[PDB]
């Protein structure tokens, strides 16, 4: 029932695409487990990251891009819809100008496109989570 973590999969994203992840943190929120989702330009994990989504469970969320191997301007959110010791459903939707991030069905974070989502070739899900579901869906 569990998927390998780090989870790496080739992907093709555009407006209307949704990346759905179902998982659970591997530690209590007091221990600050992390969750990291990276939308890469290539299959190599050292490649540029169009959209980096990093949850520090119980503390904050950081979003950024890595371009020409360098981390850019970080965006921080204190919104924490994720609940201690619970399974979560995270979905990342590709809108024309931004990603819209839902947590358990509730709109929780946004990130304006810095590089077109069509540059994405690979998605990596990793850090302190167990994973049961990774789905790419599309609605025109």
């Amino acid at each position: 029932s569990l998927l390998p973590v780090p989870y790496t999969e080739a992907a093709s994203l555009s407006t209307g695409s949704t990346v759905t992840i179902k998982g659970r943190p591997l530690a209590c929120f007091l221990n600050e487990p992390y969750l990291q989702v990276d939308f890469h330009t290539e299959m190599k994990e050292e490649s540029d990251i169009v959209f980096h989504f990093q949850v520090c469970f119980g503390r904050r969320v950081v979003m950024n891009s890595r371009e020409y191997g360098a981390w850019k301007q970080q965006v921080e959110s204190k919104n924490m819809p994720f609940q201690d010791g619970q399974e979560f459903e995270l979905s990342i939707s590709v809108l024309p100008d931004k990603y819209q991030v839902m947590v358990n069905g509730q709109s929780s974070y946004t990130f304006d496109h810095r590089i077109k989502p069509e540059a994405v070739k690979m998605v990596q899900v990793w850090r302190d989570i167990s994973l049961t579901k990774f789905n790419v869906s599309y609605l025109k």
Epitope: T41, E42, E67, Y68, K116
Partner: antibody
């Protein structure tokens, strides 16, 4: 540290040829599109030519089409501009720049120091 | 063919704000979100300030802002500093012509 270094500039007679080089370092050159952008004395910027990451797709400004050839050597991390049948209107500082393609909204994030080209008798 | 048209010269006052216009066509500025703004000092390479009409480049403070309305783009600069006295160029993708540029604007910072 990311660096772009143009070379090959100099004085050329009208109708003559010149090959410019741009040496890339501090980044994975083969992953990015590249462009040449020039600036004539006392004038603004003008895009010259563009090439994709692999080198299979190229494009040229109407003013240089049929006279210039953009190419790249990904094993040597070098971008080239072969310039033939040169004219005084080609006199400019030539810059190599990146990415400049559609997926990056055509922006130029990084530039070289530029190389001077003078077409004169 | 009408090109990206900017005012050759604009003036703003130290600590205050200024706008720089760039008039284009429905093939370039009015075609998509492909507007970029560059700062330049003569003898050096241009430096990106804005991309995708309104996004700031690396280390560019929020006092630099970009927008567009129809076929015209604008660069707004608030809290004017001595460093801002320089040249500015707008750029846009143009249908079948890759990147087109404005003729440039020299900004004077008065006071």
């Amino acid at each position: 540290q990311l660096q772009l270094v143009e070379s090959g500039g100099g004085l050329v007679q009208p109708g003559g040829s010149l090959r410019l080089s741009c040496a890339a370092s501090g980044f994975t050159f083969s992953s990015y599109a590249m462009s040449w952008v020039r600036q004539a004395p006392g004038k603004g910027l003008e895009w010259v030519s563009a090439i994709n990451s692999g080198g299979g797709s190229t494009s040229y400004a109407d003013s240089v089409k049929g006279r210039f050839t953009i190419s790249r050597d990904n094993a040597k991390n070098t971008l080239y501009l072969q310039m033939n049948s040169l004219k005084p209107e080609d006199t400019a500082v030539y810059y190599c720049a990146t990415p400049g393609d559609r997926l990056w909204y055509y922006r130029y994030d990084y530039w070289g120091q530029g190389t001077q080209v003078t077409v004169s008798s | 063919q009408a090109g990206l048209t900017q005012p050759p010269s604009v003036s703003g006052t130290l600590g205050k704000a200024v706008t720089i216009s760039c008039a284009g066509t429905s093939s370039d500025i009015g075609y998509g979100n492909y507007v970029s703004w560059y700062q330049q000092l003569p003898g050096t390479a241009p430096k990106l300030l804005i991309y995708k009409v309104s996004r700031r480049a690396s280390g560019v403070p929020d006092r630099f802002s970009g927008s567009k309305s129809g076929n015209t783009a604008s660069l707004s600069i608030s809290g004017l500093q001595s460093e801002d006295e320089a040249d500015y160029y707008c750029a846009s993708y143009r249908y079948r012509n890759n990147v087109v540029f404005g003729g440039g604007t020299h900004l004077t910072v008065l006071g």
